[PDB]
């Protein structure tokens, strides 16, 4: 079965591998994340709830006052998305929050409250995301990109190599929290374990143990293994265990139980260990010289006086041995030191550490944290407990605790957010073990250590910041507050929380201005995964490691779609099938592999557990039983590609498109072109400008439909049915009876967005894709949005391309374009400009907007209306006047020079209080008329639908066809119908219609007030006039045109069609590319794409030939079936007999322009399949044909390659780039060019160009262009007067920038002057 719109033009899909999992909703990463944030979560986890619950204690200091959160509910947005975008206001929901204030009696903490005050308070103003997963901040559609940052937890880095400049590897452990203070435990080059908290001065890390209420004895009991020594008559008989002898040297002669085991100079072999274990030796005599090298563990005092004979952790000498022997210390505890692995590291720190008590440790920590002031014991204790033992000032998220327990190999998954003594000692023990050799350091770039912070998590963090900021003020106010003297609304204000949220959403390191020029651009910018951002590595601070792709990126982050330049690999996109785990990690679908069967069950796997199993390659053949036909299959066990037997395999890739993202998946033959060319092609697809009439690509991937549907550019059908009425501005869908709810179903109305200004000044145009009466199913495409054709993403426009040099006009990378392309408007793109005029307050009276402008001609004022605003639809040109504004004593807005076009609409916003001019009244009246017309249209349409609902029910059980036509349709409650459930349904519809009639005038009045009320504007402005200019930029020499395979070039010449190379058929090639760019830049995919497009157009031409002549539908059906079969078995498998025999004609007419072919990313068309496809048509199997010269007329030898490759048109048009300037306004430093942009500017003759002129014998052109052309005011004036005089003579003078430098150096206090 196929969808009806798919029946219109069904895409020939290659790919032998059968798909098991349908492509997920590409915008899930944003929509699902925000649905988690704004949702009311009863569990109070993950949402505005956790944020309120985490910060709602409100405990007064000795005031018995408490305020608690009870519930909240986001209000309905004041303005709809379209209304907020046109007004410039944010799309936000008022945050109705219900709060309960309770006051307890004094000195009665356990007593009940004396009064309860519950009320709903408006705090904050939280913006919402549209159905397309994008915010609207200030009239701009702004999207928040998900941030990939190092997850909270513990990571044992190395910093191997450069440190200490001796090859000695250091080891450090960072306790990175979600919010709080970092805690790094580093090693001194002399193997001393230091602590570095918040990257402050290095400190002996043993001080933190003392700060955690631990003495030396406890520290050595935790971090070292006690060895018991017994004083005996036989020279202090020593107790040794078998395990401690492994890896030891010949310390002495081991003789126990009157038997010798190991002699002098004999290594302790495992055989010796086994035989002494069989003998079970426990006590071994040791020479007194050996104990000198041991270190005491615990303190010892004599039993007579109790004085300190020997403290803990110092070397033992002969005098110490004599003192402990004479005292009578029978039991002696010593540390087990093994320089091989179990080396001493805490002991060295304790030698370095001069602190012996917890108070001294706290004092030193305070000194190293807050120096310059005398610390206090209470102050130090408070600082430490607020720094590590306090939830408010320090917290690890559930992901942080999970990572902590993963790295520490703990058992529990969850735990307290704050740390503890056990956590610190466990981290130190693991760091010590890493130093010893057991265990391995972790990789920061691993996706198991870098989670993804979505928009919901960022918004929750900013909300928590706002809540704590207002909590500080509430606590401060409540200290002196009085009970029962105020409403629970004065202490909390929406101002700071709203300011924080608005600042985050509008101006942030991550609040990216959405590049809304392509559906692919929107779909890949909302899925963008940036490492940069708040709480993230910066570009300069980012290492080479982070930029560079990790083996664990497979299936999680696309390794092909990254922005080249300053941030390469830092803003990498997310692969098509990857989804974010509930802890922020990146999962990946993976088919479970059973005993030998590749089972269809899809198990999402994170990066940490991917290594544990072995992953099979997607390009592994199966025998339809899940059995690899392939006894050894290539696999990815631990990030290493290696052949594995079938029985070894534990998991398989979900499909062949897993690794690539949506931006890189749409490139056909991605398996052929080079990775750099693939990267550039994926990047350039995001910046193609929509053509006027977008058309499907002849060769594609099959994800274009998925990208177009998933993105919000098109108008998908939420409910199926039939198209009752279709219009270029609206589409009405009559929902089917089996797809509509019993109540309030009616029919669906879709208001397609007409020509609207976009973020990159392009047209967001939606054209209907259906006619009247066309059946439509659920989730179907109805309107072809920008760069969309028949529900398929149509970025550019495919055309004939011949690969051959042509007189140098395609010299190295330039593109040659025929006159035929320009003639048929293939690349004419509508650009909507936003020329906004503002009337601010001015001294000595304000400025008017009337048409009275002095020192101007009547011709310029002819376009403007009587009130000084350009007539809608007027075709203005460069330098023309749009709206007449004169300042009090000629500041009217004018079209910028060069740009032209016709005004599409002029919207005016006027603040309340100032009377609106004639044009504003006319526009407001037309807006009211349009709103009333739309409301009446929906009134009549929904009334017709509801009557059809009623009439259909009234065909049985009291049917009166004649009686219905008699009485007017307004009243039907008097009709006689059986007292059954049908009568109840009619009564329900009648009551609903009555309530709707009551609400109709209310909402109409609300709309009238919305269009009447003065729109909020910036302070000190009268009214703002926005004029939208539609520029139709045709293709021109210099316009940057680029295909999908990384081949980019500027159009050199628009060559007349008569000069184009034509084949024997006479059809001239539309574009003549350069073959020389194929071998070096290995974009060989474009050659495969060219051949497949040639085959597709051959099929289309055969269909056209058998369609232009009146042929039987049987011939069309058999040819279409032959085309869709195409030899080698494919997943497509479309049968033409199941069609209705008249939609076959529609299909053939839709394939007249070319056969649509889908080439999946990594299992697309092979060379044999393409050759067979060429053989299907009249075209040769070689793919290249003889072409005759356009001018000479004789065929080119060595027949050239032609085909219809899908090449885009990037938005880097030459029209934008022209920046010529002679003289203009100057800067502060008096550098004349004034930072060239829209502002009329000269290009920075930078330091490199100055060096270049210095290398030449240039001292006059350089001098003129560094002095008289740039900043010398007298010099500039004299040069201008001289050139207009005709004498090109330079009056040198001196650059004013040097005078500025002299003044700045003098202002420092350094006299710098010149000698005369």
């Amino acid at each position: 079965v196929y969808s009806y719109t798919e029946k219109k033009r069904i895409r020939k899909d290659f790919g032998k591998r059968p798909q098991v999992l349908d492509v997920p909703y590409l915008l899930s990463i944003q929509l699902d994340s925000f649905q988690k944030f704004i949702e009311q979560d009863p569990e109070g986890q993950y949402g505005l709830e956790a944020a309120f619950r985490s910060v709602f204690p409100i405990q007064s200091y000795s005031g018995n006052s408490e305020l608690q959160y009870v519930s909240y509910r986001l209000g309905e947005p004041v303005f709809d998305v379209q209304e907020c975008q046109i007004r410039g206001v944010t799309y936000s929901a008022p945050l109705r929050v219900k709060l309960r204030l309770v006051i307890y009696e004094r000195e009665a903490p356990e007593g009940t409250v004396k009064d309860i005050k519950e009320q709903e308070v408006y705090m904050g103003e939280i913006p919402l995301m549209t159905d397309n997963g994008t915010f609207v901040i200030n009239g701009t559609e702004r999207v928040i990109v998900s941030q990939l940052h190092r997850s909270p937890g513990v990571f044992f880095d190395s910093d191997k190599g450069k440190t200490h400049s001796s090859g000695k590897v250091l080891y450090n452990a960072r306790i990175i929290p979600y919010r709080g203070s970092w805690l790094d435990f580093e090693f001194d080059p002399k193997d001393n374990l230091f602590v570095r908290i918040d990257r402050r001065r290095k400190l002996p890390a043993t001080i933190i143990l003392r700060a955690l209420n631990y003495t030396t004895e406890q520290i050595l009991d935790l971090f070292f293994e006690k060895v018991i020594f017994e004083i005996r008559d036989n020279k202090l008989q020593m107790e040794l265990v078998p395990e401690r002898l492994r890896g030891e040297t010949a310390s002495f002669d081991i003789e126990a139980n009157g038997k010798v085991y190991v002699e002098k100079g004999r290594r302790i072999t495992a055989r010796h260990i086994r035989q002494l274990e069989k003998d079970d030796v426990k006590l071994i005599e040791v020479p007194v010289e050996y104990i000198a090298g041991k270190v005491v563990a615990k303190d010892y005092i004599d039993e007579s006086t109790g004085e300190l004979i020997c403290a803990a952790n110092m070397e033992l000498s002969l005098d110490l041995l004599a003192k402990l022997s004479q005292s009578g210390h029978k039991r002696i505890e010593t540390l087990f030191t093994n320089d091989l692995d179990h080396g001493p590291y805490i002991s060295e720190t304790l030698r370095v550490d001069p602190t012996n008590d917890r108070l001294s440790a706290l004092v030193e920590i305070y000194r190293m944290m807050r120096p310059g002031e005398p610390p206090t014991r209470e102050a130090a204790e408070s600082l430490f407990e607020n720094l590590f033992f306090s939830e408010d000032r320090y917290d690890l998220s559930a992901v942080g605790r999970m990572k902590f327990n993963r790295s520490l190999l703990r058992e529990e998954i969850e735990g307290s957010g704050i740390l503890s003594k056990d956590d610190i000692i466990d981290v130190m023990k693991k760091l010590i073990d890493i130093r010893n050799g057991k265990g391995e350091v972790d990789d920061i770039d691993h996706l198991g250590n870098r989670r993804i912070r979505s928009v919901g998590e960022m918004a929750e963090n900013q909300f928590r910041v706002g809540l704590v900021r207002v909590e500080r003020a509430v606590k401060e106010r409540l200290s002196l507050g009085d009970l029962d003297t105020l409403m629970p609304q004065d202490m909390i204000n929406a101002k700071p929380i709203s300011a924080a949220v608005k600042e985050f959403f509008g101006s942030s390191q991550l609040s990216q201005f959405m590049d809304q020029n392509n559906p692919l651009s929107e779909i890949t910018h909302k899925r963008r995964i940036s490492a940069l951002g708040p709480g993230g590595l910066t570009r300069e601070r980012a290492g080479f490691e982070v930029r560079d792709v990790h083996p664990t990126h497979y299936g999680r982050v696309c390794p092909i779609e990254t922005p080249e330049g300053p941030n390469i690999g830092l803003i990498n996109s997310l692969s098509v099938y990857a989804q974010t785990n509930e802890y922020g990690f990146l999962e990946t679908p993976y088919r479970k592999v059973t005993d030998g069967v590749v089972t269809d069950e899809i198990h999402y796997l994170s990066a940490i557990e991917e290594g544990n199993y072995v992953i099979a390659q997607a390009n592994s053949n199966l025998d339809e039983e899940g059995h690899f036909v392939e006894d050894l299959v290539t696999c990815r066990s631990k990030g290493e590609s290696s052949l594995f037997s079938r029985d070894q395999v534990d998991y398989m890739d979900v499909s062949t498109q897993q690794v690539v993202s949506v931006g890189a998946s749409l490139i056909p033959f991605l398996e052929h072109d080079d990775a750099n060319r693939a990267l550039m092609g994926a990047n350039m697809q995001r910046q193609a400008v929509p053509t006027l009439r977008a058309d499907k690509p002849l060769v594609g991937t099959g994800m274009e439909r998925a990208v177009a549907v998933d993105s919000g550019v098109t108008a998908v059908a939420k409910r199926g049915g039939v198209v009752q009425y279709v219009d270029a501005s609206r589409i009405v869908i009559k929902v089917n009876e089996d797809e509509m709810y019993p109540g309030e179903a009616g029919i669906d109305i879709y208001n397609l967005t007409k020509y609207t200004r976009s973020n990159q000044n392009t047209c967001i145009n939606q054209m209907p894709c259906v006619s009247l009466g066309e059946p439509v199913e659920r989730g179907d495409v109805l309107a072809d949005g920008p760069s969309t054709d028949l529900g398929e993403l149509a970025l550019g426009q495919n055309m004939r391309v011949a690969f051959m040099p042509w007189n140098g006009y395609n010299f190295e990378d330039s593109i040659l374009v025929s006159e035929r392309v320009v003639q048929e408007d293939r690349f004419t793109t509508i650009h909507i400009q936003e020329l906004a005029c503002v009337s601010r307050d001015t001294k000595l009276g304000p400025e008017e907007i009337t048409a009275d402008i002095p020192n101007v001609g009547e011709a310029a004022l002819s376009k403007l209306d009587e009130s000084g605003i350009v007539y809608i639809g007027a075709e203005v040109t460069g330098g023309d006047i749009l709206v007449g504004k004169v300042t009090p004593k000629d500041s009217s807005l004018r079209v910028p020079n060069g740009v032209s076009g016709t005004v599409i609409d002029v919207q005016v916003f006027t603040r309340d209080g100032v009377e609106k001019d004639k044009r504003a009244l006319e526009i407001e009246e037309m807006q009211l008329k349009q709103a009333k017309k739309d409301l009446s249209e929906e009134l009549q349409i929904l009334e017709a639908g509801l009557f059809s609902r009623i009439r259909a029910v009234l065909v049985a059980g009291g049917v009166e066809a004649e009686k219905l036509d008699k009485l007017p349709r307004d009243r039907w409650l008097e009709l006689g119908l059986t007292d059954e459930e049908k009568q109840n349904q009619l009564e329900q519809l009648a009551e609903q219609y009555d309530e709707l009639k009551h609400e109709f005038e209310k909402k109409l009045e609300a709309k009238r007030r919305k269009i009447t009320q003065g729109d909020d504007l910036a302070p000190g402005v009268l009214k703002i006039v926005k004029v939208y200019l539609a520029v139709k930029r045709r293709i021109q020499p210099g316009d940057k045109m680029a295909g999908r395979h990384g081949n980019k070039g500027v159009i050199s010449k628009i060559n007349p069609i008569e000069d184009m190379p034509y084949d024997e058929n006479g059809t001239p090639v539309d574009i003549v590319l350069n073959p020389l760019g194929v071998p070096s830049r290995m974009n060989i995919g474009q050659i495969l794409e060219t051949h497949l497009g040639m085959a597709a157009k051959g099929i289309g031409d055969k269909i056209n030939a058998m369609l232009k002549q009146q042929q039987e539908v049987a011939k069309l059906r058999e040819f279409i079936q032959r085309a869709y079969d195409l030899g080698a078995d494919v997943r497509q498998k479309v049968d033409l007999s199941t069609f209705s025999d008249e939609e076959v004609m529609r299909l053939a007419e839709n394939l007249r322009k070319g056969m649509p072919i889908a080439t999946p990313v990594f299992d697309g068309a092979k060379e044999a399949e393409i050759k067979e496809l060429l053989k299907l048509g009249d075209l040769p199997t070689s793919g290249q044909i003889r072409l005759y010269d356009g001018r000479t007329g004789e065929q080119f030898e060595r027949p050239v390659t032609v085909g219809y490759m899908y090449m885009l048109k990037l938005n880097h048009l030459v029209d934008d780039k022209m920046h010529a300037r002679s003289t203009g306004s100057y800067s502060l430093v008096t550098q004349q060019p004034l930072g060239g942009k829209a502002q009329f500017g000269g290009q920075r003759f930078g330091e490199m160009e100055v060096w270049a002129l210095e290398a030449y014998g240039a001292a006059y052109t350089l001098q003129e262009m560094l002095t008289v052309k740039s900043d010398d005011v007298n010099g500039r004036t004299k040069m201008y007067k001289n050139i207009v005089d005709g004498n090109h003579q330079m009056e040198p003078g001196m650059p004013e920038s040097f005078n500025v430098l002299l003044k700045e150096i003098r202002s420092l206090g350094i006299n710098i002057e010149l000698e005369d």
Partner: protein, 623 residues
């Protein structure tokens, strides 16, 4: 915004400080930018330029001419006339662009030739047209590359731009004497296709009166472009004291090589156009033309050779296709042998005969051997497989395949860049640089496995990040090099210093990396060189070593030549001309004054972007 606020020292230091932002290099007026266009019809002394850009840049000149001719009484009326773009304004504009050079300027001006002068040719459009030859000098693409145009104002500025900065005056790069305007990518391919031969081509065998008859036969279509035919040529040589003598002979050649003969100037011999004429051959041709004919004949010859190369590359139709890249028939058996060998090595490791390290080394070695074998098989299939007759039984010739012609000619491509298309792509390394044990066996003509493409994108991301870091490192190095320099200019003409450095061809254990001919060329000796005959003044003490002297040195078999080094110069606050040597951009001694510190710094720093980041003694030959 919680950011450090700029102080009185933050605006005197750093990139954004007053020095490097407003004094060292400052924005200028009379400047415009646009994307660039090829426009092969131009000559390198001129460039295309849009009408709007010429109107805006030359506004003061247009105002002055309007005032002089009385079209507008006042600047104000003339400015209104320029806004109206009245037809009279365009005619005035054509007068101020007759001989007014403009300085084409690409943004990353790495070396001296980054900015060059051009006579603007008014074109309708909005894209600057840059001559194809100077694109290599500019390192400029046609992929959205934009370059600024600056208008010299004063007579001194325009005059020195014409005399020095013109592309006609910049033929040899300052880094080395080799030409910089050499046919680079497409014209070289056209010449290479032109100068070849089929062993059996249409119109092969008949004798031709001259190049005119060769053109007549080719254009009429009755003789193939490259067919081995004897032609009669009037080869001109200047073996006399500047006089050109004529030598007429029947040199066996092809039609295509005879076509180029009318392009080359008189002085050049025919032995330079009788080869396949790749990139290196054309570079040597242009260098010989510059060293023999001079500058103007070299410019005219370069323009004509560009024209013919483009025209006959268009006529060639040197396309690219799937059948143009051939898979070796032995590639499958080489892959099978490599798989068998790695299986044997793994089996040996499993038993324990070979541990991990030696197993890894063995696998890497055998995979490299298989890669070399498949590369050789690919080259044999790509240059030897071609079978074509000679009106007889059987013969084998050098291939005319599209990719082989586009790679062997040096037009664009290399050995690895052609291996990655038909042969095994090779062992591809991980981010850390350690080689993946199992290579990317599949090539680009065939598909790539998902893991194979993952390793490929590992390498590609490594290369892209390396380039991104390396361009910044090279820019910093260029800045340091320029600034340790820029006080060193040629202040004197000679110092009479006998000191110097003994120039000797460099040997690093292998063959001669650089012969003494190309190492001492253009430098003035310090003491008289002598041949095996003692007390022989083969070259006097203070004579510049031009091409003739170096050629004489090779045939006299000199070993070490003491030469005057700039280090040994005793001149204060500069160096003398003799101690420096040839300008490396003009065929004469360095001019007294020219700044050579900045030239040297730019020459050193320009290839920084092209750099990278990471027994027994046996006699070789008889002697």
């Amino acid at each position: 915004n919680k950011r450090p606020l700029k102080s009185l020292a933050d605006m005197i230091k750093g990139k954004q400080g007053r020095f490097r932002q407003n004094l060292l290099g400052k924005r200028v007026d009379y400047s415009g930018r646009s994307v660039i266009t090829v426009g092969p019809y131009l000559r390198l002394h001129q460039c295309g330029l849009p009408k709007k850009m010429a109107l805006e840049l030359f506004k003061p000149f247009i105002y002055g001419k309007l005032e002089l001719r009385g079209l507008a009484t006042t600047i104000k009326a003339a400015k209104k006339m320029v806004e109206r773009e009245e037809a009279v304004v365009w005619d005035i504009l054509d007068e101020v662009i007759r001989e007014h050079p403009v300085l084409l300027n690409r943004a990353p001006t790495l070396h001296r030739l980054g900015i060059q002068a051009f006579e603007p040719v008014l074109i309708e459009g909005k894209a600057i047209q840059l001559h194809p030859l100077v694109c290599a000098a500019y390192n400029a693409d046609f992929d959205g590359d934009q370059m600024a145009v600056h208008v010299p104002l004063t007579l001194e500025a325009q005059l020195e731009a014409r005399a020095l900065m013109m592309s006609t005056n910049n033929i040899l790069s300052p880094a080395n004497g080799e030409p910089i305007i050499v046919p680079s990518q497409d014209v070289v391919l056209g010449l290479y296709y032109m100068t070849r031969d089929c062993v059996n081509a249409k119109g092969e065998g008949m004798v031709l009166t001259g190049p005119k008859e060769a053109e007549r036969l080719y254009r009429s279509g009755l003789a193939s472009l490259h067919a081995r035919v004897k032609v009669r040529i009037t080869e001109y040589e200047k073996d006399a004291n500047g006089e050109l003598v004529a030598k007429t002979s029947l040199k066996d050649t092809t039609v295509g090589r005879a076509i180029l003969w009318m392009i080359v100037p008189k002085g050049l011999p025919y032995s330079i156009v009788n080869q396949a004429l790749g990139k290196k051959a054309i570079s040597k041709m242009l260098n010989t033309c510059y060293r023999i004919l001079g500058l103007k004949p070299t410019v005219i010859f370069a323009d004509q050779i560009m024209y013919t190369g483009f025209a006959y590359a268009a006529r060639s139709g040197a396309s690219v296709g799937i059948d143009d890249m051939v898979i070796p028939e032995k590639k499958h058996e080489i892959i099978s042998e490599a798989e068998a060998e790695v299986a044997e090595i793994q089996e040996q490791f499993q038993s324990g005969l070979v541990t991990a390290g030696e197993r890894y080394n063995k696998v890497i070695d055998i995979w490299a051997a298989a890669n070399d074998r498949v590369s050789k098989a690919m080259m044999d299939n790509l240059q030897t497989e071609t079978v074509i007759n000679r009106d007889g039984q059987e013969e084998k010739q050098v291939s005319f395949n599209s990719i082989y012609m586009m790679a062997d000619s040096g037009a664009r491509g290399s050995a690895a860049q052609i291996r990655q298309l038909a042969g095994m792509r090779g062992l591809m390394a991980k981010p850390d640089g350690s080689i993946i044990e199992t290579p990317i066996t599949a090539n680009f003509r065939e598909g790539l496995n998902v893991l194979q493409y993952f390793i490929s994108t590992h390498g590609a991301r490594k290369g892209l990040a390396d380039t991104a870091l390396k361009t910044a490192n090279s820019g910093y190095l260029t800045r340091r090099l320029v600034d340790v320099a820029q006080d060193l200019v040629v202040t004197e003409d000679d110092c009479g210093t006998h000191e110097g450095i003994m120039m000797t061809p460099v040997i690093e254990g292998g063959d001669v990396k650089e012969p003494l001919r190309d190492r001492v060329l253009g430098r003035v000796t310090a003491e008289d060189v002598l041949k095996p005959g003692t007390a022989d003044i083969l070259v006097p003490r203070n004579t510049l070593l031009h091409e003739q002297w170096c050629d004489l040195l090779e045939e006299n078999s000199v070993d070490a030549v003491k030469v005057r080094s700039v280090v040994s110069c005793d001149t204060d606050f500069g160096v003398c001309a003799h101690c420096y040597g040839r300008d490396l951009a003009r065929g004469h001694i360095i001019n007294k004054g020219e700044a050579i510190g900045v030239i040297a710094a730019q020459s050193i720093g320009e290839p920084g972007t092209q750099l990278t980041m990471r027994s027994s003694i046996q006699v070789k030959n008889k002697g």
